[PDB]
Write a protein that binds this ligand. Structure first.
Ligand SMILES: CCCCCCCC/C=C\CCCCCCCC(=O)O[C@@H](COC(=O)CCCCCCCCCCCCCCC)COP(=O)([O-])OCC[N+](C)(C)C
Ligand SMILES: CCCCCCCC/C=C\CCCCCCCC(=O)O[C@@H](COC(=O)CCCCCCCCCCCCCCC)COP(=O)([O-])OCC[N+](C)(C)C
Ligand SMILES: Nc1ncnc2c1ncn2[C@@H]1O[C@H](COP(=O)(O)OP(=O)(O)OP(=O)(O)O)[C@@H](O)[C@H]1O
Ligand SMILES: Nc1ncnc2c1ncn2[C@@H]1O[C@H](COP(=O)(O)OP(=O)(O)OP(=O)(O)O)[C@@H](O)[C@H]1O
Ligand SMILES: Cn1c(=O)c2c(ncn2C)n(C)c1=O
Ligand SMILES: [Ca+2]
Ligand SMILES: [Ca+2]
Ligand SMILES: [Zn+2]
Ligand SMILES: [Zn+2]
Lengths: 546, 241
């Protein structure tokens, strides 16, 4: 019993479909470092996001196809977590240590940046403008507190430095995952689908046309686990598309690959800076800059950098950093996600408002223009509807904002032949614009709140009622007490399937057993038939009592 | 404390009127709707403060001429000479006044910054007056729906599944009034409650085999005696119980 208790965390168990028609149970070893890396909060958050998006967007037919991909991505991330874990050579080692320090404390730098922005704004809360020095006016900090201006200067410098550290850290730990995902997707597309061989991408596909740059670059499979994708594509499509055309498209040399296949040399790489710069692939760097610039978080951080530099140029610009609270706190993100859920419908609704108010201006310029005199003095009238530019601007700026429509601002229509017509005009403008459209605006936000809440509830219920791997309902396992918990924690646990991949990858091919070799060979062929979908061990041997 | 202060000054007793909220049950339910999303509400007012502060920042640097609230020409009263007064004015007047801050601010017609001020007023009207108050109302409405859905779910779960064994009502519904008989005689909650006292009171030497077995398992914090997933009727369905 003591040995089993000691080795319980390291004993992983999974279930596979099997070479035969019977579900088979597989036992293997889980490394301590693998479990330590898996339990990291970042990995936990990534797994939560993956589960949420998979459940919400469905994709049942591709479920396993997504899951395996997730595992691959996650593995790369924790490799980075292993790498960034806690004359020329001296500066290089200082640079790598500094980069690692920035990578480790990125979130702390974000928190410090938010706090520094709050402090800078609180200091700026004491500005005052006066004509006399402390013809145009001057600005100065009017306060009785000492050394406030030097403190503000130091806070500005520290804020910019910390934000720059944020930029460098984010480039250190987040970009390689995006690059790896893009390389993986492009490799799958050009190896199986052949989107560039005997097929072309669509013109509207911006990313499809952008991915054409790294086709012939020597560093194409960089930042990705596989480095022989181009050779496999050549072997797959040379006999049809033409070996020479494939070589030119992928930038390969048949003689070079042949001689390296026979035997390769081991030249010494020069550590010089000039030769290193010469060895930099310009096209690959251009493609990497293009893909990284399309990211949202990187653009947000670049905007934060620009705001910091403008803050050095003019201190008041730092006020913009207050909006980072929306990106900072999670409840901020949720409540503003309600607004962003129906954003297209919202810009929609304001456009419809503009059109209907334009029609009201059209019918107000042709007949009811006399009633638009906003000048009290009789000597100099001020007609706001002499031309439709002023009339439409007046209706847009005054009629929409003023409660009760445009009739309140417009003169009294009593005592005129068009009094009934003007009454209909004002009442219909009040109902159609002030009431209905703003009601739509509020209803969109309320519906978005309900939508997000329903999505979260559906995800929770789906997770709590059905198993992720086999899909069998919780009731059948609930026949036996705590059956569902045992099934979801021991038999078909997600972490066990994740760990089995690494256990296959680390150990040598000659050490794989029959089951391990079978799973590995079917994995290579992108075949997901080993997952026990629709069946499990318990019902396989229900008569035999397992 | 309120009562003692009421003795000190009688008017303090007015505070006790708020006890109606704690007193009547419907009071508690309707205010539970408000308290359901309280963090989201203090949230939303904080975001309001930040966005109005940004509007004051862009109103202190350029559009400060239009903040003269004094009718007399001899003694002007600028409300945006410093950002303390400008921010207080926007917080206290702009938010409360329907239509944004443009109504209180002077007429921008006839100036080079008239279009810029039009954008300023219209965007302050939409972003502050419309969107944020819409969020405030939507949170309360969503909380009402949340509590109602919770009560409905609890009622349905109680009325459809048995609490002890968890078997659905349909299987018992095969026999007429089967679910009622099962939930009133076989797996009644009160019977399980009473059995614990019946075991605690009687002496240990008087316990039978079944009573002694349940008692020992209870003492070891083991809950395997509860018939979860099985019951008498399906145990002897072939034998007709
Ligand atoms: C987005 C909503 C838009 C509609 C808002 C409706 C609110 C107001 C509704 C009604 C008040 C109508 C005006 C007062 C009556 C005047 C009579 C008249 O038009 O005869 C004219 C002749 O005929 C024409 O020139 C064309 C006749 C139709 C004009 C447009 C009517 C729009 C109806 C829309 C249907 C809406 C139904 C109900 C909607 C709730 C006389 O014109 P005049 O004096 O000889 O010349 C004038 C100068 N002019 C040459 C420049 C033209
Ligand atoms: C929460 C919402 C916040 C934003 C509300 C926006 C409403 C209003 C929008 C627009 C009206 C803008 C003002 C009128 C035009 C003036 C030109 C100008 O700025 O040039 C200036 C030079 O340049 C600078 O000093 C910096 C330029 C940018 C200033 C800040 C713009 C904010 C944009 C936000 C993006 C919003 C996009 C749309 C949002 C719906 C000229 O300045 P000056 O006269 O030489 O010196 C003045 C005194 N000073 C030294 C103290 C500075
Ligand atoms: N094959 C499966 N593997 C794991 N969990 C499963 C599987 N199928 C269903 N589940 C669900 O997983 C739930 C348990 O979640 P789990 O223990 O994985 O949470 P977690 O990721 O540790 O949580 P947290 O969000 O706190 O980090 C069960 O309630 C069950 O409904
Ligand atoms: N094991 C169980 N024991 C008792 N009731 C159960 C059980 N499982 C489910 N129920 C549900 O409880 C309901 C009966 O509730 P009950 O008769 O206890 O109401 P009550 O609590 O006496 O009424 P009140 O709330 O007014 O006191 C049944 O409709 C049944 O669906
Ligand atoms: C098959 N395979 C993988 O699936 C893999 C990997 N590194 C990460 N992953 C996910 N390597 C090196 C690999 O050969
Ligand atoms: Ca072997
Ligand atoms: Ca006895
Ligand atoms: Zn399962
Ligand atoms: Zn029962």
């Amino acid at each position: 019993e003591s040995i089993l208790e000691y080795f319980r965390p390291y004993l992983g168990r999974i279930e596979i479909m099997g070479a035969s028609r019977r579900i088979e149970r597989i036992y293997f070893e889980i490394s301590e470092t693998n479990r330590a890396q898996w339990e990291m909060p970042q990995v936990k958050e990534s797994k939560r996001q993956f589960i949420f998006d998979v459940v919400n967007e469905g994709g049942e037919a591709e479920k396993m196809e997504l899951f395996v991909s997730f595992c691959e991505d996650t593995i790369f991330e924790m490799q980075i977590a292993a790498q960034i874990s806690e004359f020329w050579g001296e500066l290089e080692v200082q640079r790598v240590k500094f980069l690692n320090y920035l990578s480790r404390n990125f979130y702390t730098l974000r928190f410090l940046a938010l706090f520094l922005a709050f402090a800078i704004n609180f200091i700026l809360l004491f500005y005052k403008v006066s004509d006399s020095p402390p013809n145009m006016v001057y600005y100065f900090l009017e306060e009785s507190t000492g050394y406030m201006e030097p403190a503000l200067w130091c806070l500005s410098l520290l804020h910019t430095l910390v934000a720059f550290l944020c930029i460098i850290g984010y480039n250190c730990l987040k970009v390689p995952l995006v690059i790896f995902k893009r390389e993986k997707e492009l490799a799958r597309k050009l190896e199986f689908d052949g989107l560039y061989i005997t097929e072309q991408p669509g013109d509207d596909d911006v990313k499809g046309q952008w991915d054409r740059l790294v086709l012939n670059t020597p560093s194409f499979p960089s930042n990705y686990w596989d480095k022989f994708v181009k050779r496999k594509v050549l072997d797959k499509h040379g006999d049809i598309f033409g070996r020479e055309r494939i070589a030119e498209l992928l930038g390969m040399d048949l003689a070079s690959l042949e001689i390296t296949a026979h035997n390769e040399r081991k030249p010494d790489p020069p550590p010089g800076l000039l030769t290193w710069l010469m060895s930099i692939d310009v096209k690959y760097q251009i493609w990497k800059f293009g893909v990284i610039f399309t990211d949202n978080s990187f653009l947000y951080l670049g905007w934060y950098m620009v705001m910091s530099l403008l803050g050095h140029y003019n201190n008041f610009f730092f006020a913009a950093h207050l909006l980072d609270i929306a990106m900072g706190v999670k409840t901020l993100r949720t409540i503003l996600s309600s607004v962003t859920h129906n954003g297209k419908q919202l810009v929609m609704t304001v456009g419809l408002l503009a059109v209907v108010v334009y029609l009201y201006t059209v019918v107000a310029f042709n007949f009811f223009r006399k009633f638009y005199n906003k000048s009290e003095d009789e000597d100099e009238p001020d007609m706001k509807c002499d031309d439709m530019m002023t009339c439409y601007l007046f209706h847009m700026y005054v009629g929409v904002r003023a409660g009760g429509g445009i009739g309140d601002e417009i003169e009294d229509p009593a005592g005129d032949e068009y009094e009934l017509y003007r009454v209909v005009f004002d009442i219909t403008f009040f109902f159609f614009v002030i009431v209905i459209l703003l009601a739509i605006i509020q209803g969109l936000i309320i519906d978005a709140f309900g939508e997000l809440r329903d999505q979260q509830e559906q995800v929770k219920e789906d997770m709590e009622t059905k198993c992720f791997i086999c899909g069998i309902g919780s009731d059948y396992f609930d026949t036996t007490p705590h059956g569902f918990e045992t099934h979801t924690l021991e038999e078909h646990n997600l972490a066990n399937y994740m760990f089995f991949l690494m256990y296959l990858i680390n150990k040598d091919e000659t050490e794989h057993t029959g089951q391990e070799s079978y799973v590995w060979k079917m994995y290579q062929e992108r075949c997901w038939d080993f997952f026990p979908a629709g069946d499990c061990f318990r019902k396989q041997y229900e008569d035999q009592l397992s």
